Structures are given as structure tokens and as C-alpha cells.
Design a protein around this ligand. Structure first.
Ligand SMILES: CCO[C@@H]1C[C@@H]2CN(C(=O)[C@@H](NC(=O)[C@H](C)NC)C3CCC(F)(F)CC3)[C@H](C(=O)N[C@@H]3CCOc4ccccc43)CN2C1
Ligand SMILES: CCO[C@@H]1C[C@@H]2CN(C(=O)[C@@H](NC(=O)[C@H](C)NC)C3CCC(F)(F)CC3)[C@H](C(=O)N[C@@H]3CCOc4ccccc43)CN2C1
Ligand SMILES: [Zn+2]
Ligand SMILES: [Zn+2]
Ligand SMILES: [Zn+2]
Ligand SMILES: [Zn+2]
Lengths: 96, 96
């Protein structure tokens, strides 16, 4: 079923905690909203629910947009951002 | 919000009905199961939930796969098929 991969990190306050002095430019606070947590090797992160990992962030990129871009099938994403958002970003990423 | 775009076509029996002597190659049972109904022009179909239109079907195609390939945001799709399935087809598609 659609059960989250890491239920430990389902709680927001737990995710934000993994960014313990996070040196990279992308806003840690926003990253944890989008359902990601740090790892400890580079700027690597993962969604608690879908398990999709992202790395090498440009300065002002949006975690939500990237989450949708590469991992549109996440339930946490869908509940939080919805159908239109996800499909809209997908049909944009497509045009490349 | 994740409400169905066409709740009239939420029922499978409602969907299957729209394929009144369906001439085209693709299987109508599979099409309606995948959440599609016919529009009555060509082989154009839409998904009752996400509203994603698809057309010009090839003889052997899987409606579920095309649903996922093009509209990975569908709430109906996620529930029926799962995170892993959707992300998987997206990952594959991406490299084409
Ligand atoms: C190849 C097809 O695979 C798809 C593409 C997408 C790229 N990506 C990425 O993280 C890409 N990052 C971004 O798009 C960032 C968020 N914006 C620029 C990077 C891919 C390598 C690069 F050199 F191009 C720098 C950008 C993710 C990625 O590579 N994640 C890695 C892969 C292995 O698993 C993990 C686990 C944890 C963290 C990261 C990853 C997911 N990828 C799937
Ligand atoms: C550029 C970004 O747009 C994306 C691409 C994707 C392709 N597609 C399609 O339906 C494509 N069909 C398929 O992939 C079929 C299922 N397999 C070959 C065909 C588009 C026409 C074609 F002659 F080129 C043959 C492929 C769908 C499509 O064209 N749907 C149309 C768009 C307008 O709205 C409706 C409404 C009802 C039915 C179809 C559509 C969805 N598209 C979005
Ligand atoms: Zn996710
Ligand atoms: Zn996409
Ligand atoms: Zn759909
Ligand atoms: Zn895709």
C-alpha cells in the first residue's frame, strides 16, 4: 500500500532536527516542510514518505518544486500540494 | 484540492457505458478500470479524477502506464497503483 518508507521522520520536528548546522544555501526550514531530512553526506536529503533522494541544490530552488519534479508519486506531496500542482510541474519538466 | 474533476464518471459502470461499441484497438475494460471515459470524438479519453486527456492509442498499450506516464498526479492512480509504480514509470519515461 502507500505506507511511508521512514515513519520515524513522519513528524516535522524530527526532520528539521536532522539539519543540525546545515551549511548549504537551500532553506532548511522549507526543506523539512516539503518532507525531506538530511543525511550527512553532502547536501543529500530524502522524503520521509516516498524515499526519493535529491542532491546538488542550486541557491534558490524550491524543495516542493523539486520533490514534484523528480518524485510526483509521493502521497505526502499529493496530500500537501494536490493534483494540479504535481501534474503542472510534470507537464513543464516534460517540455525540455 | 484532490476532489475528482468529473465525479459523474466516478463509477466504473458509468465509465464503461461511454464506450458504446468501442472500435479502437485498446481494451475498454482496461481503459475504464484505469479511470478513463470516452468523449465521443476519435479515441480521446479523459480520467474522471485528474481530468487528464489521452489520444492516438497504439494496439497493445497499457492504459494504466499511459495514465502514469503523463499524469502522475492523479489521486485515483496513487490509490490504485501506488507511489512505487508511479515514480518508476516517471523515472523510466524521463530517460527517453
Ligand atoms: C539520471 C536519472 O535519474 C533521475 C534524475 C534525478 C536527479 N537527482 C538529483 O538530485 C539532481 N539534483 C537536482 O535536480 C537538484 C535538486 N536541482 C538542481 C542531480 C543529478 C546529478 C547531477 F549531476 F545532474 C546534479 C543534479 C536525483 C538523484 O540523483 N538522487 C540520488 C540518486 C541515488 O539515490 C539518492 C539517495 C539519496 C540522495 C540522492 C540520491 C534523482 N534523480 C533521478
Ligand atoms: C507537450 C506536453 O503535452 C503532454 C504530452 C501528452 C501526449 N498525449 C497523448 O495523448 C499522446 N498519446 C499517447 O501517448 C498514446 C496514449 N500512446 C501513443 C499523443 C499526442 C498526439 C500524437 F499524435 F502526437 C501522438 C501522441 C496527451 C494529449 O495529447 N492529450 C490531449 C491534450 C489536450 O487535451 C486533451 C483532451 C482530451 C484528449 C486528449 C487531450 C497528453 N499530453 C500532454
Ligand atoms: Zn515524497
Ligand atoms: Zn515530472
Ligand atoms: Zn487520473
Ligand atoms: Zn513522468
Amino acid at each position: 500500500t502507500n505506507l511511508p518508507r521512514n515513519p520515524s521522520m513522519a513528524d516535522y520536528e524530527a526532520r528539521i532536527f536532522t539539519f543540525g548546522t546545515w551549511i548549504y544555501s537551500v532553506n532548511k526550514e522549507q526543506l523539512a516542510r516539503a518532507g525531506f531530512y538530511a543525511l550527512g553526506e553532502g547536501d543529500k536529503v530524502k522524503c520521509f514518505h516516498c524515499g526519493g533522494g535529491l542532491t546538488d541544490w542550486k541557491p534558490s530552488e524550491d524543495p516542493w518544486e523539486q520533490h514534484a519534479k523528480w518524485y510526483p508519486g509521493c502521497k505526502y506531496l499529493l496530500e500537501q500540494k494536490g493534483q494540479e500542482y504535481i501534474n503542472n510541474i510534470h507537464l513543464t519538466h516534460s517540455l525540455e
